[PDB]
Each structure stands twice: as structure tokens, then as C-alpha cells.
Design a protein around this nucleic acid. Structure first.
Lengths: 184, 151, 50, 137, 100, 101, 75, 140
RNA sequence: CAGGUCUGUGAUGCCCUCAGACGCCCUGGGCCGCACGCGCGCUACACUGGCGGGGCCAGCCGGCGCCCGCCAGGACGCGCGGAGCCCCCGCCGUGGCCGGGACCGCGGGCUGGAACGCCCCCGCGCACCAGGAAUGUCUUGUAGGCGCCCGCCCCCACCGCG
């Protein structure tokens, strides 16, 4: 299977053994349009191509609700712009970006009378927040700029994968985690 | 467009061994399979050239998993009506899978071929049950409701 | 005389059969029954619910 | 058959150059400065648009075969939304005169024959359309 | 003589129309009466507010009059089918019409 | 100046003569649809010289003569002048009054 | 805050602008418009000239976004 | 290499940078015979980006603008279609638009007419709702 | 429930009215005014966008042709018939700009007995660059986006029901 008729899933293995189970490349299908019901069942969401989850996160804000065909086109162009600069498999750079963008600690009240305490983010939530943060940083970046959505999405993934704080998603992870360390 | 009796109306006879029906989101495809050279035609048009250029791989997906050699030797005439473009691309992959499987029929090879498709993609050979829900009074949406001004 | 000042046509005078009311004629299938008048007479016309 | 084997757009553009080269249609040049469809607002910027529309309209009449589609039906095939109003936008048919002019030229050319109700493609015109299609292939 | 007489049965109730179908098919089966041609149901619909006034959350009564119509084809002598109409079971409130 | 013709020429201008020059509504009112006897009879009173007809449109000969028009309560006095010819007097007589909040 | 170069850039600085994009390993029309401050409308017409040259090959070509990488220029 | 700075044509500095079919769209905010294209299309080509308008071609564009039917432009267009006083149809552009508009507005004041009386009070003409959307800037 | 409807009703107690009528009609005008406050909605604030051609996809359910007109619409006939989004190639390209389309001046139509109703053509080019305190709806074919039909109806939907 070559996603966008160009990229295999053979070398795409997640190094993070805590997050590897919830990221799946086995179900990948050229063109991330599988109409499989992810809403059904508590953890069927986990068994979904990571690239399709990104294609579902991309279509937000209402003015762009439901247009998967346009989102997956962006994912292909973004992957080409990641291949063009990183010079690595872009499905594998996304896998590293999802792994890093996910914070491991959050703040919730915990049966307190507004006093939040430290909690541990679940390994599914880490994957869901990570992808959501990648797409929302790009969304905000391309709102009023000549820079296309594809270019900013390509750059957040490239920045997250290393861990550069320029990524809106990694800044969010460090803010969430730090509030969790103090509310500990 | 709505489940009309227009199977033979497009093509007269032609020894179409099977007449499968694949239906996704109010779109039905009647696919007619006969011995051929591996040609597949949809709506009197080459299957490779389909309207959602991005989803043109989804149409050819059953051929890839099953194998080109098994597909070779078949000619399929598919007529899709109802529904919309993406469902019509989902209906034709379902129709192609069901029809090619019909040639094996009750064979052990069919059970393997149904399992082979069901593993790569389940519901490729099984209809998707989801259908549109009705609008209810007091809401523009089927379940959405009007904003409450007070309270 | 009186005739020229009596019921001169300005437009159609349409009423619900049974109510003689101009409002809400509801002539969707030529059934000129009032919206309220229709609910009293729906069983007789045979109109039925889900 | 043939016109299907060649992608629809790669046929229409090549046929537009062909229908300007063979002198088929001949733009009225009075409809050249008009905008097709009440729906649009800024008029075609192509300047060869009449030829693209002419090649598209013969290709429609070819796939119609004996259906013999009317000019108003073709106008509903070029209908778009009238956007730019506070009231929500709705679909609006294309200008009838432009299409009527295109179908008129084909009837005189004998590329398309007249039929009960709407006109349909003539055999003589079909020959030109399919030979061009196979030639592109 | 030998013309084609079109019988059309228009009925609000499905069970009543199915009964007329059984009688018509049985009487004309010898005369080669055609099997019932069922028309797409005419689900004439009126949705009206349940309240005479405008008070309360606006509620709607969804009333549907479904009309079921069966077209029948018999080709034979006219006099026989005129009698065939008497032979078929008469259903009150259900109508039959013959068109040549 | 009014629609090309000078005022003296436009007052001599026949009603079907000044109509090609007038606007679309006027052509429908004086041409295709036309007017009834009561509208004509009011025009006849103007001819006699030497109303509730808001629908009636101004005719060229009537210029210079002031016609009372009902607003639904009182007969508003409306003068007839050259640039307003062919325009319904219903836009000249006002039923409402200023907002005055 | 706009890119004032709009039509046919300027004169002889156009050659240096061409040199800058050739220096980039891979380019996008929007990327030249921000990096060179020349507008993306100008970038499309500039790019076709250096694609005819054969300096860059379009890895992916779409009406939405067109992206190019240098075929060679290695040494 | 060939690009020129903004030229003042018709009392406005039309930017040389913006496409010529739309750089003329802001002709002092008054005029636009082309409807985005017709006037220039009749004489020259569009999409020029502007700043390359030859002065002779610029004069030719001015000539069609000033005289509509001399170039055979469609009578269905034109800012003025009947001339309330003159009786003739011609394109009215730039300052003339303001002058003609003031005369029409003066004419409704001269012959008392509801459109003018509403205009004097600033009350909306043509638009018929003031109960709610007539708040405007807290004043009509 | 003292919720709402006596103004849907040859449903109706009682009071009023009852030929200078509160009967029933007829002409004109209002309900649609508007310093303003508030409730549904609608369209925007752009590039995942606008604009041009091309592909072309429904369902509740459903007529068309030919010719003329810039459209709007018309004439003359007959027996029939189908979306947006999205996809594809161009263009503009971060500029209140070609975003947006409020207003406002001619003009062309329509329907009716009659515009003040609606449609359309060239202008004209408003706020709005993402909305405080608050608040609402929603768990799969759902939200949201996007069309379409019908009800009332001379014309007319930013509405309701689908």
C-alpha cells in the first residue's frame, strides 16, 4: 500500500512503546477516505490510519466542515512538501509528530471543592490531542497569510517531529504539562 | 434513478452472467459481468477515469487486493444512479467486489476471496447500513434544535 | 346604482368549506379546508398519522 | 465510446481549437461581450470561451444520442448559484441565447440534425466527434 | 369485439384495494386479465399545527393520505367485462374506472 | 428639459406620443394594459378646465393645474409641474407624516 | 505591508531574484512571494520560465498548489 | 523589466501594480463602463497588470468611455439610460456622476415627491423596514 | 393549570351593538411607519477564499420544445423531465483588495383592475479584518457545511415543514 500512490507503511513504526499501540499503519489505504464508522465503539477509533485521523481533524471551523476530499488533497501536498525538505518518509515524520505533540500530564479538579490536581493523560487522548493540536496550529497560522494551509501543516509536522517549540502543538504540550506539574 | 427497472434498457442481452447490486448512501450500481479481457466500464466510461480524481484509487482497490490476473478475463458494465459522487465510488467498489466474487460462487476459493477482501477492508463486500435521518419539527437539523431565547 | 356598489370584484373570495373563513384555506390538493377546520375533519377525509 | 476513452476536458479543449480552426460555429462577436448566465457577475475571461462552450455542447449532444436534449435543458447544464446577495444564493439557469446560437450553427453545419422537440446529433457530426476522439487516443 | 379496456382501482386502504385486486384477477383470469400494476403510492400530505391558537411550543400533526391505485389490462369482448364488473366483489368507498 | 422635448413641445406632446420616451411602468399603464373609464373621466375633468386615483399617472396636458388627492383622510393639494410628468401622483401625495419622535 | 514588486519585477535585480530561487533546493510559488517579497502572481510567471529552463521539476502539480524541486544543480 | 508607476487617469491615481481590468475598477469610485472587462476588451486586451498601457491605447480607452455608441457599446449598459431631462442615453463617469445625482436629488426636492422628502430626512428610500434595522448608528 | 384560543367554527352563556348597523359591501389609506431597547434568522469578515470556463451529483418528488431578448422576460406551440457542494485547469494574489454586498441613481421586465410587490442591467461600493459580560444546540449518517421542494401565495422566504 502506497499512500497517495507514493509512500509505504513498511518503515513507519512508532518508537514510543507507550504510544505505538494507539497509532496504526496496518489499515492504511491509498487515499485516506475509509468511510469506516470510528464513532461506533469506545476504542475502534484507535484502529484507524493515523493519516485519516489527520484528514478528519483538518476539516473544522464549519466553513470547511465535511470536505474530506479537499483535506486529503492538502495532506498529499503537505507530505510532498515534507518529503521535499526533510528528505524522509512523510508518513514516518507524521508518526513522530503525533508522538511528541501529545502531553502526558493534565490538570483536572479531582473531586475538589476550582483547585485542580495533576492527572495522567491516557495513551489514546495523547494521540487525539496530538493530531488536533497539529491541525489547529496550522489553522490559526494560515487564517490571514499568503502562506497556504498545506505549507503551515507541513511545517508544524516538521517542527513537532524534532520537538521545536515553534510548533503551536509543542508549545501547547509544554504549557499543559507545566500547569500539571505545578497543580501537582 | 430510484431502483427503477432499467437493467436491460442500457444494454440488450450480451450474455451478462451476473447482475449484482451495490448500494451506499441511496446510490445503487447494477454491474453486469461476462468473460472479457480484464476491461471494467462504469457509466459507459473507463473505470480508471472517474470523477473524484482523488478517489479514483478507491474504485480500483478491489482489483489490487484480489490480483490483476484473477480480474483478467472479465468485462463488467456498471450503471450507477442515485446518491452522490463519493457514494457512487463506494458503490462501484462494492459492486465490483460482489460481482467478481459471484464468479467463484460457493467455492472454497470464494470463501478465501471474501476473507481476503474482508481483511484489507471489511464492508467492501458488505452493504453499509447508515441512511439519512428525518428533520423533526422545532429543529432545522434531524436532531439539532432551534436556539432557546429565554431559559 | 346599488349593484355597482355591491360585491364588485377586487380579488378571489376563498373560504374553508365547513368554516367560511378566509384565513389558512390550505388548498394544497384543492381541499379548501381551514388549518383548524381540517384537524376536526381529517378522519372523515381519511388522512392518517404514522 | 471514443469520446469517453479520452478524458472529457482533454477532448473539449482540443475540440475548441478544432472548431475555431475549421471555422465551425463562427463566434457572433455580439455575444462575445455578453456574460453567460444571470447567475455570474464578471463575464468569461477566456476570450475563446465560445469555442470551448461550442465543443462542450456538441459533446453533450453526442452522449445524449437519440435523447434529443433541448436548448433550455443545456442552459440548466450550465446553471450556477447567483452569489453576492444577502438573501441565501440559489441555482440560476445559463443564458438561453448563447446556447441557442451554438445549436443554430450546428444545425446549419449539419453536424447536428433537427428532431421531434429538441435537436439531436446527426450521423455526419458524430463522425467528426469520434474520429477526433480516437485521434487524441 | 376486441379492444383493450383499462381498469383503474383507486383506494385509500391497502387491504381494501388488495381485496378488489383478488376479485378482479379471479373474474378475468379466464379472460387473460393482467396481474396488478401497482402505482407509486400517492402519499398526499398535510402538516398542520396541533393548536387552534399559537400558544405553546409549536407542535405539528403529520397527516398522510396514501392513495393506492392498481391498473388492470384485459383484451376481449366489451360486454363480458361490463358483466365482470358486477361479478367482482363490490368494496364500498373504493372506485373502479374503465378507459378505452 | 424633459426627456428631450422642450416644455412647450412636451405639453403639446400627445399621451401616446410622449409614451415611447416614458419609463417602463408608463408604457404598461397607457399601452398594453391601458386604463378604465373612471381614470379617463378624471382626465376629462382636466380637459374641462378652460380625486382618489393614486393609480392615475400624470399626462402632459395636465401640467400647470393643481389636483387634490385623497391620502385616505384629507385631500392633499398636489401641483403638476414639468419634470414629474408620466409619474404616478401616488408618489407626489403622502399618506404618512414625518417620524416626529 | 504588501509585496510592491507586482509586474515583471524591476530590471537587472530580476536576474538576482532568479538566482535566489535557483539557490533554493525546492520552491513553492507562495514561498518565493514571501521570501523574495515579489508577490505570488509574479512568482507563477517567473517559475514557468525556470521550469522551461529545466532548472526545477514539478514534483506535484495542482491548480491549488504547484511545488517544484531542482532536478540536479548538485555540482 | 517593463513596469511603470501609477498614472492619474480621470482625477484618480490608478495604481500601475493592480491588474488593468480591475485597476480601472477603482476609477475614483465613479464610472466603470467595463463591468470588469467590456470597455478595455473592445479596444485592447485585459489582464495587462497595468503600467504598460500605451498612451495612444490609453487615449483609445478614454475615447470609448467618453462616446459609447461611437464604439458600438451596448445601450443596455451605461450609467444613464434615458436622461431624465436630456432624453439621451450615455455613460456618465467620475465627477459627472455626482453632479447628475445631485440634480436628480434636487429634482425630487423641486417637485415634492416622497422619495425626495424621505431623502431630506435621511429616512431610507426603497428599503421599507425601519422598526428594527433602522437603529443604524443609533440614528437613521 | 383558574396556561392559551369567544378573531377557525349554525361551538356558545351573558353584556354591548342592532337601517346615522359593530349587518354586508364600495373607494382611498394603514397593519410594512420608527430618537430607540430586545427575540429568531440571514450574509459576511476571505486563500481550506473570491473569480472565470470545464466535469457533474441527488432525494421529498418531479413536464417541455422552438424562436426572440443582455438578462429579466416574451411570442408561438406541444407532450413530456433532474442539484449545489465537490472534482479539474486558469487568474487574483494578504491590499477592506477582485473579500463583503448594505445603500443609492437612471433604465429593462412581470403580476394585477391598480405598486408601494417581485425580478433584472450598468453604475454606486456600508459596516464587518472574528465579536465583551453572558448564553444555546448537538454523540454517525449525528453536528456542521451545501443545495432542493412544498405550505401560505397575483407577485413575493433571509420563514416553517420536508
Amino acid at each position: 500500500v502506497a499512500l497517495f500512490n507514493k509512500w509505504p507503511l513498511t518503515d513507519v513504526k512508532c518508537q514510543d512503546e507507550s504510544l505505538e499501540a494507539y497509532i496504526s499503519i496496518d489499515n492504511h489505504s491509498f487515499v485516506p477516505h475509509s468511510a469506516g464508522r470510528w464513532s461506533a465503539k469506545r476504542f475502534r477509533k484507535a484502529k484507524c490510519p493515523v493519516v485519516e485521523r489527520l484528514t478528519n481533524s483538518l476539516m473544522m471551523h464549519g466553513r470547511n466542515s465535511g470536505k474530506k476530499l479537499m483535506a486529503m488533497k492538502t495532506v498529499g501536498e503537505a507530505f510532498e512538501l515534507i518529503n521535499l525538505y526533510t528528505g524522509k518518509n512523510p508518513v514516518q515524520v507524521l508518526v513522530d509528530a503525533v508522538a511528541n505533540s501529545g502531553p502526558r500530564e493534565d490538570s483536572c479538579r479531582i473531586g475538589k471543592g476550582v483547585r485542580r490536581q495533576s492527572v495522567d493523560v491516557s495513551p489514546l487522548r495523547r494521540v487525539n490531542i496530538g493530531i488536533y493540536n497539529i491541525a489547529t496550529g496550522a489553522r490559526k497560522a494560515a487564517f490571514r497569510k499568503v502562506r497556504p494551509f498545506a505549507e503551515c501543516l507541513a511545517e508544524e509536522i516538521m517542527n513537532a517531529a524534532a520537538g521545536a517549540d515553534k510548533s503551536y502543538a509543542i508549545s501547547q504540550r509544554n504549557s499543559v504539562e507545566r500547569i500539571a506539574v505545578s497543580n501537582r | 434513478d430510484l431502483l427503477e427497472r432499467n437493467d436491460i434498457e442500457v444494454r440488450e442481452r450480451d450474455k451478462y452472467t451476473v447482475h449484482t447490486l451495490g448500494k451506499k448512501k441511496n446510490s445503487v450500481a447494477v454491474a453486469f459481468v461476462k468473460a472479457g479481457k480484464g476491461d471494467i466500464l462504469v457509466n459507459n466510461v473507463p473505470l480508471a477515469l472517474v470523477r473524484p480524481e482523488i478517489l479514483r484509487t478507491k474504485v480500483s482497490e478491489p482489483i489490487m487486493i484480489l490480483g490483476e490476473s484473477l480480474f483478467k478475463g472479465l468485462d463488467m458494465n456498471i450503471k450507477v444512479a442515485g446518491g452522490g459522487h463519493v457514494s457512487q465510488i463506494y458503490a462501484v467498489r462494492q459492486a465490483i467486489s460482489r460481482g467478481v466474487l459471484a464468479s467463484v460462487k460457493d467455492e472454497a476459493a470464494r470463501s478465501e476471496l471474501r476473507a481476503k477482501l474482508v481483511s484489507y477492508d471489511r464492508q467492501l463486500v458488505v452493504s453499509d447500513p447508515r441512511r439519512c435521518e428525518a428533520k423533526k419539527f422545532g429543529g432545522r437539523g434531524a436532531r439539532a434544535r432551534r436556539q432557546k431565547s429565554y431559559r | 346604482m346599488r349593484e355597482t356598489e355591491f360585491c364588485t370584484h377586487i380579488a378571489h373570495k376563498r373560504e374553508c368549506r365547513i368554516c367560511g373563513n378566509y384565513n389558512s384555506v390550505y388548498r394544497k390538493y384543492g381541499l379548501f379546508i381551514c388549518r383548524r377546520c381540517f384537524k376536526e375533519n381529517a378522519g372523515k377525509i381519511g388522512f392518517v398519522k404514522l | 465510446s471514443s469520446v469517453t476513452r479520452v478524458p472529457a476536458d482533454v477532448f473539449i479543449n482540443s475540440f475548441a481549437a478544432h472548431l475555431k480552426n475549421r471555422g465551425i460555429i463562427k463566434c457572433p462577436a455580439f455575444t462575445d461581450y455578453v456574460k453567460t448566465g444571470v447567475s455570474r457577475q464578471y463575464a468569461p475571461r477566456d476570450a475563446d470561451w465560445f469555442y470551448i462552450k461550442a465543443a462542450s455542447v456538441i459533446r453533450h449532444f453526442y452522449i445524449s444520442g437519440s435523447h434529443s436534449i433541448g436548448v433550455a435543458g443545456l442552459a440548466r447544464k450550465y446553471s450556477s448559484l447567483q452569489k453576492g446577495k444577502t438573501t441565501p444564493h440559489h441555482t440560476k439557469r445559463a443564458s438561453c441565447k448563447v446556447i441557442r446560437s451554438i445549436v443554430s450553427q450546428f444545425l446549419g453545419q449539419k453536424l447536428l440534425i433537427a428532431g421531434e422537440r429538441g435537436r439531436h446529433i446527426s450521423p455526419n457530426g458524430r463522425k467528426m466527434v469520434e474520429d477526433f476522439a480516437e485521434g487524441l487516443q | 369485439m376486441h379492444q383493450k379496456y383499462t381498469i383503474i382501482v383507486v383506494g385509500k386502504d391497502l387491504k381494501l384495494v388488495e381485496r378488489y385486486v383478488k376479485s378482479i384477477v379471479k373474474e378475468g383470469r379466464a379472460f387473460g386479465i393482467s396481474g396488478p400494476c401497482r402505482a407509486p403510492v400517492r402519499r398526499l400530505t398535510i402538516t398542520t399545527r396541533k393548536s387552534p391558537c399559537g400558544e405553546g411550543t409549536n407542535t405539528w400533526h403529520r397527516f398522510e393520505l396514501r392513495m393506492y391505485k392498481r391498473t388492470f389490462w384485459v383484451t376481449c369482448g366489451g360486454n363480458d367485462i361490463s358483466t365482470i364488473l358486477s361479478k367482482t366483489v363490490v368494496i364500498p368507498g373504493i372506485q373502479v374506472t374503465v378507459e378505452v | 428639459n424633459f426627456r428631450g422635448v422642450e416644455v412647450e413641445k412636451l405639453a403639446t406632446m400627445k399621451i401616446t406620443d410622449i409614451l415611447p420616451k416614458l419609463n417602463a411602468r408608463c408604457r404598461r399603464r397607457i399601452g398594453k394594459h391601458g386604463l378604465s373609464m373612471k381614470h379617463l373621466r378624471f382626465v376629462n375633468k382636466l380637459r374641462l378646465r378652460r380625486t382618489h386615483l393614486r393609480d392615475m399617472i400624470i399626462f402632459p396636458e395636465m401640467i400647470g393645474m393643481t389636483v387634490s388627492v385623497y391620502n385616505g383622510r384629507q385631500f392633499i393639494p398636489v401641483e403638476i409641474k414639468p419634470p414629474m410628468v408620466g409619474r404616478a401622483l401616488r408618489e407626489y401625495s403622502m399618506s404618512y407624516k414625518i417620524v416626529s419622535h | 505591508k504588501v509585496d510592491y514588486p507586482t509586474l515583471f519585477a524591476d530590471e537587472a535585480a530580476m536576474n538576482e531574484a532568479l538566482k535566489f530561487i535557483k539557490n533554493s533546493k525546492c520552491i513553492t510559488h507562495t514561498q518565493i512571494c514571501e521570501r523574495l517579497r515579489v508577490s505570488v502572481a509574479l512568482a507563477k510567471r517567473v517559475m514557468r520560465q525556470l521550469v522551461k529552463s529545466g532548472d526545477f521539476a514539478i514534483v506535484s502539480k495542482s491548480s491549488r498548489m504547484t511545488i517544484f524541486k531542482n532536478m540536479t544543480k548538485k555540482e | 523589466n517593463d513596469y511603470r508607476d501609477l498614472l492619474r487617469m480621470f482625477n484618480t491615481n490608478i495604481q500601475g501594480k493592480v491588474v488593468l481590468e480591475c485597476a480601472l475598477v477603482g476609477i475614483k469610485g465613479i464610472g466603470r463602463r467595463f463591468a470588469n472587462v467590456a470597455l478595455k476588451k473592445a479596444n485592447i486586451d485585459v489582464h495587462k497588470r497595468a503600467g504598460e498601457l500605451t498612451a495612444a491605447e490609453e487615449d483609445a480607452l478614454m475615447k470609448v468611455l467618453e462616446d459609447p455608441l461611437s464604439h458600438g457599446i451596448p445601450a443596455w449598459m451605461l450609467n444613464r439610460n434615458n436622461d431624465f431631462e436630456s432624453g439621451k442615453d450615455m455613460h456618465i463617469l467620475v465627477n459627472t456622476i455626482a453632479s447628475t445625482h445631485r440634480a436628480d436629488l434636487e429634482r425630487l426636492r423641486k417637485t415634492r415627491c416622497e422619495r425626495g422628502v424621505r431623502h431630506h430626512h435621511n429616512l431610507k428610500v426603497r428599503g421599507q423596514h425601519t422598526k428594527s434595522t433602522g437603529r443604524r448608528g443609533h440614528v437613521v
